[PDB]
Design goal:
Chain lengths: 231, 231, 231, 231, 231, 231
């Protein structure tokens, strides 16, 4: 990784292998749940492409999904090669070469080379770009492997609103369709697939009613207060 | 995180996945509680608004909680909107631009602008501002996860004052009413829903008497259904 | 806490959450036992009032004992407030005002200000005074848990004196009895209800003995359990 | 190792027992998996040849395997001596000299010379060469005691495609055949040993198509839902 | 404990709850065995009496033992008063006072007296004085609660000499008698209580060979099953 | 123990009982074993001779070999002391004395001077000498506890040159058998009861074939060695 807030010059610094074992622990235990991606976002911060392949390639398991990840990163590399014109040397003797797509994967590049483009005036953030390609591919892997579908989250007759919301959100989180697509569902579908006791407050009483009145909706067996269950 | 320092200039510091993994170990295995609030408060000390977000976005479980937390912040963001001036003349120097409420909450702002506002004279304490707005959504969660309802608890007929007080005090604290109301729970309701030996001792002891005597009451007695006392 | 202890150069450092979480687990597992009291003293060493408030209120242990521990902080600050009458209240740009009861607990006050009384000449011992208010509150909770009966610990005719001496020193650690009340019990409990062969030996010794002499005594019971030199 | 990032990068740090225990656990779970080579690359960041020897003899299990690895070290160490005619400078330690393949494997060298060499201008990268020799013996064991032959795996009779390729890509990963054979096995052995109506889909999609289109196919083989993670 | 020795700026530190949880697992495990005497004596070199009273009162079990430790300390605090009275010569304002034996055990002294005496030149080391009454205390508990005799150990018929010699040296360490007597014990009892076939091997080996020779001879009687008994 | 992260200044901290205990945790659980020696090196770099004396005397187990090691660390002191000319100074302000046998072991030395020597420029490394002395005692306990009699390790009559490896190389890790007589073990004894096909491969290549060449020889008997090493 590269560190530049301890003193004002960039210096390279080793990865802790314990953290790698913890990232392995989180995808070994929790798999393709959309919550894992935060640990990786924290992992990949302030990295090089050499740190990034180490991070991608420490996950030994899940190789269909890693091979889907590998296809997504090859297609962004390949996009990068056809969106530029074809020459890639220094503009003038003694200036540096231009980043290729494969250099961004650290494939055809070495640590000093990647870091001199990161420290140059102006720099090219090849590490943050390679992290994007993984992060797209993680967002892809969570959706592909989600067991539930966001239109068919439907509220039972014995299920609290808070329990419905816990099923809806996680599934909504793991689905990869757009932000406004996602907000539009929370105006529509969230109401639509609610049980009539919850839906009755959400349609008729609307914006006027308290947040609390909605979150304690469809929980009235035994009156106020939350109900202890082992599940 | 950030390193404010004794006489040096304040400085940014490298992300910890081990803090992050450690934080949601409480959410996953202890759940949300008044007891989380000073651990979260000590854990989120020295944190930027972006570190605060990384921590909250990690949380996978608890999504009717997470939605209660987002909504409860949107009131205090929109409160920040009208406090902010319509016109007051020229923007201060030594700061990148001037924030609005989303820029406080790390939402729209870059980690340079955030530390920029801290480094300006005087400081804008964006992450300390935000740190309460989370605690308010935390407060709201505490009132949606309460399972003891302050009227309908009582002391059982021969049950310890030690266990009753634990019963009444931990309920009282999560109840969201004014202190004058909270004092009425302890003045009236308390006595009343206590069994006759614990009220009778409390009636019998004077105002400068020991609480070590009150706190041992009702251990090895028969109470209603089993007594021989006429009162 | 404060670091550079007792040296003319003291500076505050935030408590690690790992340290705090060690104090939360120490408290949840060992509970309000005699053992945990000096464990609190270590952590209290150079704690501020503002750390001490965190330590007291972050813990998920029995609340009726915590409420009497808090009610001793309230008794001790109205006593201090009784001890020193205080002239002139807070003013906005002021410094080095007199410390009220509320402020020594850290309630009406802020970190920089608490620091101000500790770095004064000669220094106020702001956390020590509050620290002593907690230690009393601890000691009172041990008297609530005390065995009802000292006369039903096992003290029959085969029960050995060293194991009985544990049974008694644990019955005493809970009671916390004065040297004049212990002098009554060493004769007419301890040495009286010793097993026959050991009490014959203890009748020759007499009960005014030291523990070192009492433990040295008892060679003439069968086997090696009571002997001080073993063949 | 040196993990130093401030100053002249010269201050050596001791490797930790705790880290070497977390490493020893990985060998206990997964000795023969290629997810170990990046964990071990991550553990050998910044190592001296003393440290590399400490880490090689920390593993106690897999006797024949770590004595294959040591065979492999000694072969390259002897390769090195007939690759280089005439080693420059003293034949004895502790004066300016060319490290032999034995000084490189740490055997005739000292930490004192190993730091001299790594701190030289240009730096002589003894802990990196010694790393690469361990990596070459480690890959050979990892391929040698691999559990799966690529040829003998097949799809199961009422089995999905998703768990069949979960194994096939992971098996193609520690495969010893070169990329041109690896693409023939992808091209042929995948779709040869696929079950008949998936073979249908495979050939209908063709080879150039995204893997993601194939990962959503052959799911009605598993039928109705009955075992996935609860939201 | 006192840290940062020999730079010209001594520092004091405090003991973390996680350290304390580790300490009292170890002291309650090894209370009656000599194993405890090095642990205490190492931590004395860096401990104030306030540090040593922390290590004493956190242990939490063995009340006859651990209190008799404290009685021994107050016994030897009394001794100190009449072996050296404070202040035989002059005394004046601004001069550092002589320690009393209650100032040694920390009971009457402040922490600044205790660091002040220690950090003088030639030093007054009150931590090293207090360690004598501690180590005496430790020998009194392990002497009284260890019933183990050097006079009942022996080698059975199928017992390895290495197994007998290891138990004998462990019971030798436990036995409190001066080295010249122990040299006698090895001379005599160790040959005398050895197994006849092996008293013959030692008669054939003679008296002037090494400890390595006795324990590597005379082994392997235990059928196939011998491997469980010896390492 | 000492720690240093920066040039030309450092921090001696007091010995953790947690880290003392880890060493005890390796000895109590795994005893004397090859991997004690790595772990012990990784631990002991920052340790003073007083740290190392604490680690030895805290052992409670394996007491006869702790004596064998005590004799070994003492005779190495004697060999260091005897074989350099003696000109043994006193404690002299601003002059460093010449380490002698007893000084290297802490015996006739004190904590200031142990930091002194270890942290000079160029260093005087007494704890690095003292490491090697302890190590040389430990090779003897291991060599006693490890297997022996390389001649008696035979191949089953139905074995296909394949399963002897793990006991055979454990004995060769224990002490190295010389290349001619290890050829002779292989040619004369080891292959003697073997199938004709394995006897034809072993004689063609010679007794000194690679462990890679032999484990990939004799294919498809189904004998000894046809089990998984990790499952």
């Amino acid at each position: 990784p590269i560190v530049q807030n301890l003193q004002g010059q960039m210096v390279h610094q080793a990865i802790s292998p314990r953290t790698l074992n913890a990232w392995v622990k989180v995808v070994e235990e929790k798999a393709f749940s959309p919550e894992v991606i935060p640990m990786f976002s924290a992992l990949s911060e302030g990295a090089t492409p050499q740190d990034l392949n180490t991070m991608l390639n420490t996950v030994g398991g899940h190789q269909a999904a890693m091979q889907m990840l590998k296809e997504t990163i090859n297609e962004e590399a390949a996009e990068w090669d056809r969106l530029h014109p074809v020459h890639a040397g220094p503009i003038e003797p003694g200036q540096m070469r231009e980043p290729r797509g494969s250099d961004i994967a650290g494939t055809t590049s070495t640590l000093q080379e990647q870091i001199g483009w990161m420290t140059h005036n102006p720099p090219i953030p090849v590490g943050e770009i390679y992290k994007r390609w993984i992060i797209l591919g993680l967002n892809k892997i969570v959706r592909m492997y989600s067991p539930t579908s966001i239109l068919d989250i439907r509220q039972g007759p014995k299920e609290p609103f808070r329990d419905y919301v816990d099923r809806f959100y996680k599934t909504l989180r793991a689905e990869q369709a757009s932000q406004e697509v996602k907000n539009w569902m929370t105006e529509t579908l969230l109401v639509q697939n609610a049980n009539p006791d919850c839906k009755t407050i959400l349609k008729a009483l609307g914006p006027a009613a308290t947040l609390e009145e909605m979150m304690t909706a469809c929980q009235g067996v035994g009156g106020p207060g939350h109900k202890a269950r082992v599940l």
